[PDB]
Ligand binder design. Structure first.
Ligand SMILES: *[C@@H]1O[C@H](CO)[C@@H](O)[C@H](O)[C@H]1NC(C)=O
Ligand code: NA
Lengths: 32, 61, 259
């Protein structure tokens, strides 16, 4: 709800590249 | 703070009775182990070493 | 970090190293929340029972690091502290209540591929993401085991470590310890019989427990590595300062003093 470019990694989100284990975190929001 | 096992009797701020911290105003006595009242002494800060490459000496001033 | 893996380069570019001047030691982890402000645990800076009461001139922050021991020239930045701020109701005698601290840098640090700030949560983010069973990420250069056999085992990692841990129910947290758990603490880690393992350990304190929102793709710091009874013991859990719970203090410190 504020404004400055935080939490978007230059070598990952900014390049549309996924890190090795972030899927594990995302999946945890949905179970399985 | 990561509490680790007591290594000497009279220690505190360490894990005494199983995985339980023995807090201040208590001290560990090593048996089964028991943590009881009585001014204890903090287990010395679990010390690190010095294998770091030197940083520019202007920062160590 | 116990049972983690080597971070990829730039994987956690908000990760900060608190570095002691003389002797040269890793003190703690920490995180970058703006170009002049770094968030850490209070016991990193103030812990009387160990005779710890650092002033600004005793420490450095090192930002953009990957290797633990290397001076990573033209990658890391090394900043001096302007002022340290400990939460005024941080309680060290009893239970590490309100274990939170901020450091203001003398100069702003320039952002790069390796150095970039994490977000702090608003209310909707805290409410959504901070729920039991959801996983966050912990990073640090702390110990790889609680104890190892001296001069033989690997003790400190050569490179920043990363581990993913599930947030644990508040009643299970409280039943795993005799310490009074408060509002501004949460706990994380696998249960025995979940098979998987992992924990923060010595030297990881002050570092960030972060979570990625699936809806805006941003990483939020939800916790600070705060305290543990051992590392990775079955039926024990890592405790973390609940950053959102204490954000009003961060606000007070930052627009009275800095930004
Ligand atoms: C530690 O140093 C601070 C800041 O200089 C000082 O005000 C305070 O009295 C000291 N605190 C303790 C607990 O010794
Ligand atoms: Na555990």
């Amino acid at each position: 709800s504020g404004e400055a470019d935080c939490g978007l990694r230059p070598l990952f989100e900014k390049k549309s590249l996924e890190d090795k284990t972030e899927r594990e975190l995302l999946e945890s929001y949905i179970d399985g | 703070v990561v509490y680790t096992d007591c290594t000497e009797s009279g220690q505190n701020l360490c894990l005494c009775e199983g995985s339980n911290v023995c807090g201040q105003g208590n001290k560990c006595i090593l048996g089964k182990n028991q943590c009881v009242t009585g001014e204890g002494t903090p287990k010395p800060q679990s010390h690190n070493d010095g294998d770091f490459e030197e940083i520019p000496e202007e920062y160590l001033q | 970090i116990v049972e983690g893996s080597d971070a990829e380069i730039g994987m956690s570019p908000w990760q900060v190293m608190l570095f002691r001047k003389s002797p040269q030691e890793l003190l703690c982890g920490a995180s970058l929340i703006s170009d002049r402000w770094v968030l850490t645990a209070a016991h990193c800076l103030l812990y009387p029972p160990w005779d710890k009461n650092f002033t600004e001139n005793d420490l450095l922050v090192r930002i953009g690091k990957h290797s633990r021991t290397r001076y990573e020239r033209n990658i890391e930045k090394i900043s001096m502290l302007e002022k340290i701020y400990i939460h005024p109701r941080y309680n060290w005698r009893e239970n590490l209540d309100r274990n939170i601290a901020l450091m203001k840098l003398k100069k702003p640090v320039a952002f790069s591929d390796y150095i970039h700030p994490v977000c702090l949560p608003d209310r909707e983010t805290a409410a959504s993401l901070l729920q039991a069973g959801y996983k966050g990420r912990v990073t640090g250069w702390g110990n790889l085991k609680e104890t190892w056999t001296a001069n033989v085992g690997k003790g400190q990692p050569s490179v920043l470590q990363v581990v993913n841990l599930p947030i644990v129910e508040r009643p299970v947290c409280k039943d795993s310890t005799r310490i009074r758990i408060t509002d501004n603490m949460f706990c994380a880690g696998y249960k025995p019989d979940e098979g998987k393992r992992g924990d923060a350990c010595e030297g990881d304190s002050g570092g960030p427990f972060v979570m990625k929102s699936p809806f805006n793709n941003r990483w939020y710091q939800m916790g600070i590595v705060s305290w543990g009874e051992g590392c990775d013991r079955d039926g024990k859990y890592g405790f973390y300062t609940h950053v959102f719970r204490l954000k009003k203090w961060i606000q007070k410190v930052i627009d009275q003093f800095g930004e």
